[PDB]
Amino acid sequence: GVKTEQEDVLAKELEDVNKWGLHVFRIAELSGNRPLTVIMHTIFQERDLLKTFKIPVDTLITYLMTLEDHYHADVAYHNNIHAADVVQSTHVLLSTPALEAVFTDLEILAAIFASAIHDVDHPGVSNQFLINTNSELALMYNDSSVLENHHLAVGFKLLQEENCDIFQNLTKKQRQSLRKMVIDIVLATDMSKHMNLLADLKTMVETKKVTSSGVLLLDNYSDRIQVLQNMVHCADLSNPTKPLQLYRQWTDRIMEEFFRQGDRERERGMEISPMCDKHNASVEKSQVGFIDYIVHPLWETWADLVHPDAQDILDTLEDNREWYQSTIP
Ligand SMILES: COc1ccc(C2=NN(C3CCN(c4ncnc5ccsc45)CC3)C(=O)[C@@H]3CC=CC[C@H]23)cc1OCc1ccccc1C(F)(F)F
Ligand SMILES: [Mg+2]
Ligand SMILES: [Zn+2]
C-alpha cells in the first residue's frame, strides 16, 4: 500500500498543482500519459469533491481514464495534456483571493468538469476546416460551434459507459444546474464568442461591486456564469502567460497542428487558412498578434476584475510578448 518510485516522483510534481507554471509535460511523462486523470484526481481530493458529491473513487478513476482515452494522442496540441493544463489553470484561477468563498461546490465542479471535457475527441483541425470539408461533425451541428458541441456531447455520453457515471448520486436539480453550467462554459470556449465574452467582462469591471471583504459580488446567474465562462476561456488562452519553457512547447504543438491542417488544406486545394504555413506566415509575428489582439486584452481585463491577484501572470505575459518581439528580423 506504498507508492512505486515512479508514482512518488509523480506525487512530488503534483505538490505544484496549486501553482501557475506546473510541470504538466513532466507529469504527462511520469503518469504514463495520464496528466488529465492524475491532475483531475488530485484536484477532486484536494477540493473534497468526492465526499461533497458522493462520487465513488473507482467510478471517478474509470470515467477519467475513459475521458483521457477519448483525447487523440496523434494530435499535437488539442490532446489530454492541454485538457490537464486547462483543468489545472481553471483550478488555480478558482483559488484567486478576489473570488474566495464566492462560488458554490457545484459551480466549482462545473468549472473543473467543463475544463476536463472542453476539447475531448478534438480531431486536430478547426470549425472552418470541418465546415468547408463537409465533415459529419459540421453537418450534425448545422455548422455552429461544431467542435464545442461535439466535446460536450462526448464528455456527457461517456458518463453512460460501465461504472463511468460520476454524478450518479447528484439530485435531478443538481444535475440539471451542473449540465447547464457545463454547456454554457464549453460553448464559450469557441473563439468566435471571444469578442462578446470580453465585452461582457469589460462591462462587468466598470460595474464591479464587492462585499465587506475584497471578494467580488455576483448576485445573479448571468454574472456568475459570465465569470466562470471567462475564467475557463482565460485557462484555455493561458499558454502565453506560463513560463517560456512551457509557452514555447504549446507554440510548437499549435504550429504542428496548424501546419498539419495546412498540409491537409493543400491536397484539398481549399487555399491555406490563418498563418498556417512556412512558405510565408512567421511563427513569432503570429504569437505577437495573438498576444496583442486576444490574450492581452482578455488577461488585462481579468487582472482588473481580480486586481491585484493576477499581476505576476500579466507580467509574465508582457515579458513573453517582448521575448517573441525581439526574435523578429
Ligand atoms: C500557443 O499558442 C496558441 C495557442 C492556442 C491558439 C488558439 N488559437 N485560435 C485562434 C485565435 C484567433 N485566430 C486568428 N486567426 C487569424 N489571425 C489572427 C490574429 C490574431 S488572432 C488570429 C484563429 C483561431 C483558436 O481558435 C484555438 C482554439 C481555442 C482557443 C485558442 C486556440 C493559438 C496560439 O497561437 C496563436 C496562433 C497560432 C497559430 C496560428 C495563428 C495564431 C494566431 F495568433 F493568429 F491566433
Ligand atoms: Mg476548444
Ligand atoms: Zn482548448
Coordinates of N, CA, C and O and ligand atoms in Angstrom, one line a residue, residues 78 82 118-120 122 147-148 151 186 189-191 236, ligand 2:
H78 N -4.3 19.8 -29.2 CA -5.7 19.6 -28.7 C -5.8 18.1 -28.2 O -6.7 17.4 -28.7
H82 N -3.3 19.2 -22.9 CA -3.9 20.5 -23.0 C -5.2 20.6 -22.1 O -5.3 21.6 -21.3
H118 N -13.6 19.9 -22.3 CA -13.8 21.0 -23.2 C -13.2 20.8 -24.6 O -13.7 21.5 -25.5
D119 N -12.2 20.0 -24.8 CA -11.6 19.7 -26.1 C -11.7 18.2 -26.4 O -11.0 17.8 -27.4
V120 N -12.4 17.4 -25.7 CA -12.4 15.9 -25.9 C -12.7 15.5 -27.3 O -13.8 15.9 -27.8
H122 N -11.1 16.0 -30.0 CA -10.7 17.0 -31.0 C -9.9 16.4 -32.1 O -8.9 15.7 -31.8
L147 N -17.2 22.0 -33.0 CA -16.2 21.2 -32.1 C -16.8 21.3 -30.7 O -16.9 20.3 -30.0
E148 N -17.1 22.5 -30.2 CA -17.5 22.7 -28.8 C -18.8 21.9 -28.5 O -18.9 21.3 -27.4
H151 N -17.5 18.2 -28.2 CA -16.8 18.0 -26.9 C -17.8 17.7 -25.8 O -17.6 16.7 -25.0
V186 N -18.4 25.4 -21.8 CA -17.7 24.8 -23.0 C -18.1 25.6 -24.3 O -17.2 25.8 -25.2
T189 N -15.9 28.5 -25.1 CA -14.5 28.2 -25.5 C -14.3 28.4 -27.0 O -13.2 28.4 -27.4
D190 N -15.4 28.5 -27.7 CA -15.4 28.9 -29.2 C -14.9 30.3 -29.3 O -15.5 31.2 -28.7
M191 N -13.8 30.5 -30.1 CA -13.1 31.8 -30.2 C -14.0 32.9 -30.9 O -13.8 34.0 -30.6
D236 N -8.0 28.5 -21.1 CA -7.8 27.9 -22.4 C -6.8 28.8 -23.2 O -6.1 28.2 -24.1
Ligands
MG2 MG -11.7 24.2 -27.9

